[PDB]
Design a protein around this ligand. Structure first.
Ligand SMILES: C[C@@H](n1cc(-c2cncc(N3CCCC3)n2)nn1)n1ccc(N2CCC[C@@H](NCC3CC3)C2)cc1=O
Ligand SMILES: [Ca+2]
Ligand SMILES: [Ca+2]
Ligand SMILES: [Ca+2]
Lengths: 213, 254
């Protein structure tokens, strides 16, 4: 519970990285660029690319936090079950300004203005020694330019599972944190300190290049 | 800064700190809804025994509020097995909407299965966020699978068929947590549904004396009285009134 191992990351295409080298994690979080069936300014993963992510190698016992929007409320549930998780909670983030007023955005496809972002919580295996029920399932927090999601999620996760190793998929550089390894394609090279992980990484990627396998 | 830490520290839920909880439109529109509304109609019916097909004509909007066990935690409760077996597709218009109260547990998954079983696609997820301003110093017994204290309920919106009448509402209702054993849902859900101007044939399944409302047919086991007549009800939607959205002028006669 004391442990505060410094931030580590890997710039990669998460479709191609061999995540078996990273070992096992108490908590996985992912914020995927879901294919939400529209022209977008960023690259998305196809439904099949999301299904094929090797999430099952990342944990034996623990929790998955999976951000979902639009049709991914249903696809994320499919992925979660396919990867061997049961959904046991759903966090909502109410997006506010500096004055705790809701920021309300409208898609042309939609009946309602949207005030929130959803995060599915999955469980795999027999997690022991987590602190369930410290936090509640509603986050009220300000939109930031450097992150897609509020930093409050990292505090909720730490209180739930203090000192355990954690992994983030589709993280930005602002998201790197103690006890976390961050994966994403906007990160700046590779930064690894865990001797177990540094060994396995050298041994898998001796010429430090992560190509289409 | 951090309302999550603050909740851990004090027991005040982050939603307690949301503020503000232009629109001379809404006067003119809540007015047209009020003028187009059918007289309230209601029927006592044990929905497990009762043949749902007796409810005609086919509905533009269905609000479905089955009494989940999780609402009562402080016999007549419905499981997701029971709910999924309801013949909702038999009474829904080919173009129509459903609003299903799913709770905060397994309903968030099983309610989506139900929507697709009945032929709808889930198009909105409306969250009822409950504040604890009046009593921050109470501690709910956690559901065994729960990771977090649950402080909201979800009402899923479904659509079947194809996609003076705009869109101002948000997918959030914020109210104080009701007293123990008060199972009522916020009346704000009716406001959201009526504001969509989806048609005038509106069914509330598992409604109660307390939820009866102009413009709605209420059907439920606890109703003390009934006024429902299928022929009278059908006559509200007879020509020239068949295609009204419920947000326009009543059509003039002599
Ligand atoms: C940071 C970035 N991102 C993308 C990737 C990444 C990694 N590996 C592959 C990859 N591909 C994208 C094209 C195919 C391969 N993309 N790694 N990091 N990213 C993350 C999330 C994201 N989105 C879309 C915007 C809203 C976000 N969710 C907001 C919710 C959490 C509150 C998800 C867009 C995005 O570009
Ligand atoms: Ca525990
Ligand atoms: Ca029953
Ligand atoms: Ca659906």
């Amino acid at each position: 519970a004391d442990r505060l191992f410094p931030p580590q990351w890997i710039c990669c295409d998460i479709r191609y990285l061999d995540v078996s080298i990273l070992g096992k994690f108490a908590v996985v979080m992912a914020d995927p660029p879901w294919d939400i069936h529209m022209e977008l300014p960023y690259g998305t993963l196809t439904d099949d690319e999301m299904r094929r992510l090797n999430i099952p190698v990342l944990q034996d016992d623990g929790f998955l936090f999976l951000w979902v929007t639009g049709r991914a409320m249903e696809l994320g549930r499919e992925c979660l079950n396919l990867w061997g998780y049961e959904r046991v909670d759903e966090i909502i983030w109410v997006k506010t300004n500096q004055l705790q007023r809701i920021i309300r955005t409208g898609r042309t496809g939609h009946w309602l203005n949207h005030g929130k972002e959803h995060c599915l919580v999955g469980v795999k295996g027999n997690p022991q020694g987590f602190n369930q029920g410290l936090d509640c399932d509603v986050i009220v927090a300000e939109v930031r330019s450097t992150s897609h999601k509020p930093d409050e999620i990292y505090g909720m996760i730490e209180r739930l599972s203090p000192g355990t190793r954690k992994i983030e998929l589709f993280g930005r550089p602002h998201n790197v944190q103690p006890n976390w390894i961050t994966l994403g394609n906007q990160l700046d090279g590779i930064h690894l300190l865990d001797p177990d992980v540094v060994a396995r990484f050298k041994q898998r990627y001796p010429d430090g290049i992560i190509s289409k396998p | 800064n951090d309302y999550c830490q603050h909740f851990v520290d004090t027991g005040h839920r982050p939603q307690n700190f949301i503020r503000d909880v232009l629109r001379e439109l809404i006067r003119l529109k809540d007015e047209l809804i009020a003028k187009s509304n059918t007289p309230p109609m209601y029927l006592q019916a044990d929905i497990e025994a009762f043949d749902i097909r007796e409810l005609t004509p086919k509905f533009d909007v269905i609000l479905l509020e089955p009494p989940l066990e999780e609402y009562y935690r402080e016999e007549k409760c419905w499981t997701w097995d029971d709910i999924m077996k309801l013949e909702i597709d038999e009474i829904a218009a080919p173009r129509s909407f459903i609003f299903l109260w799913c709770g905060s547990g397994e309903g968030l998954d099983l309610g989506r299965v139900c929507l697709r079983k009945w032929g709808y696609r889930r198009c909105e997820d409306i969250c009822w966020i409950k504040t604890n301003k009046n009593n921050p110093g109470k501690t709910k017994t956690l559901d065994p699978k729960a990771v977090f204290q649950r402080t909201k309920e979800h009402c899923l919106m479904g659509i079947k068929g194809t996609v003076i009448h705009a869109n101002v509402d948000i997918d959030l209702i914020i109210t104080e947590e009701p007293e123990i054993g008060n199972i009522e849902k916020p009346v704000e859900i009716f406001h959201i549904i009526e504001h969509f101007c989806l048609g005038r044939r509106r069914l509330h399944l598992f409604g109660r004396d307390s939820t009866i409302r102009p413009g709605w047919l209420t059907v439920g086991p606890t109703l003390t009285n009934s006024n429902y007549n299928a022929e009278t009800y059908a006559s509200y939607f007879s020509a020239p009134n068949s295609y009204l959205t419920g947000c326009t002028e009543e059509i003039e006669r002599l």
